[PDB]
Design a protein around this nucleic acid. Structure first.
Ligand SMILES: [Ca+2]
Length: 294
DNA sequence: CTATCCTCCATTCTCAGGTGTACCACC
DNA sequence: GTGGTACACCTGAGAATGGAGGATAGG
């Protein structure tokens, strides 16, 4: 599978994690060991992607049981990381707030690169980085380093290439199918199609840009947190804007299968074969086997 | 000592799957 | 006053987030 670059970058922007890890091993010089990882974790169904991803990075890292149903691709070697992973994400930049995480990550590996992690001044610096990464410094660690100061998250700020969006959407996107109980329809149910991209409110500026990017969409915000939902319910737009896009820039992973069954429904709908009881049944079967289950 | 390998979590973050009802069609 | 559609709102399971120790292989 080709799996061009931009789809990868996007897919990571959505699902990827860069971790900098600091652990006390009194067997060291600064009573602390500093590890750096690049991890992707996915369901059993999407194992083929990880292997295609491993391949993509010239067979680097390892794939291994992570959760009860999940598996993890990881490059934990700093030589390897600095050799293959960085030169990539320098050339093909992330555009999400991840870019900030990676950027810090990059600095930690350069420090490691010069052996300045094995020193004291290097450690304090490296901790200042981690402090600005992910959820951030954590419990045990903070209490060990208080006189400290998290490093400023960088000035991040544009969708570089369509395929980014294909990949990105494969990670955090959603091709919903709804069966609504209507009281004013011959068959008792309204058939609906919804395309949905979920994300944290940090990336509000990017999310707003999609609307302009796809010429359609009505982003909104969760009621109970800083979660945004770029959404498309307008069937005519689904028909003429969403489908023809992802048809040309194909979804990578298990989701693609959904997108297909989704399209299948959208035909049953375009033909109006959704207001028949037969058409309804044809849709249910589709509904019931796609996304959840199958 | 230093770096990479390996086998395990727990809690939040996205997914996914509903509505309510305004406005549209119709004529 | 029928037969249909699209926002705007609502609410939860359970995997992704982002970790956690080890035990080693390279010194
Ligand atoms: Ca994600």
């Amino acid at each position: 599978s080709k799996l061009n670059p931009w789809a990868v970058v996007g897919f990571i922007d959505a699902e990827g994690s860069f971790m900098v890890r600091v652990r006390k091993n009194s067997k060291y010089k600064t009573g602390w060991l500093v590890v750096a990882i690049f991890s992707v974790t996915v369901d059993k169904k999407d194992l083929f992607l990880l292997e295609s991803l491993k391949t993509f990075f010239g067979g680097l890292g390892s794939i291994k049981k992570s959760g009860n149903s999940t598996f993890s691709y990881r490059i934990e070697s700093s030589e390897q990381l600095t050799k293959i992973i960085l030169p990539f994400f320098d050339k093909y930049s992330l555009i999400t707030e991840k870019l900030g995480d990676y950027l810090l990550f990059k600095k930690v590996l350069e420090l490691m690169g010069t052996k300045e992690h094995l020193t004291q001044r290097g450690l304090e610096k490296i901790v200042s980085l981690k402090a600005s990464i992910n959820k951030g410094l954590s419990e045990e660690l903070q209490a060990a380093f208080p006189q400290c100061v998290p490093t400023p998250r960088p000035e991040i700020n544009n969708i570089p290439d369509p395929f980014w969006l294909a990949g990105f959407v494969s990670g955090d996107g959603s091709f919903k199918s709804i069966l609504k109980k209507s009281e004013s329809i011959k068959v008792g149910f309204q058939s609906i199609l919804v395309f949905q991209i979920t994300q944290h409110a940090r990336d509000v500026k990017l999310m707003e840009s999609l609307i302009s990017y796809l010429g359609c969409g009505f982003i909104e915000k969760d009621s109970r947190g800083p979660w945004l939902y770029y959404t498309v319910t307008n069937f005519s737009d689904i028909q003429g804007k969403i489908i023809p896009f992802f048809h040309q820039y194909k979804i990578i992973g298990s989701k693609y299968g959904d997108y297909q069954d989704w399209c299948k429904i959208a035909l049953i709908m375009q033909n109006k074969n959704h207001l028949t009881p037969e058409g309804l049944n044809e849709i249910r079967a589709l509904k019931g086997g796609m996304n959840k289950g199958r």
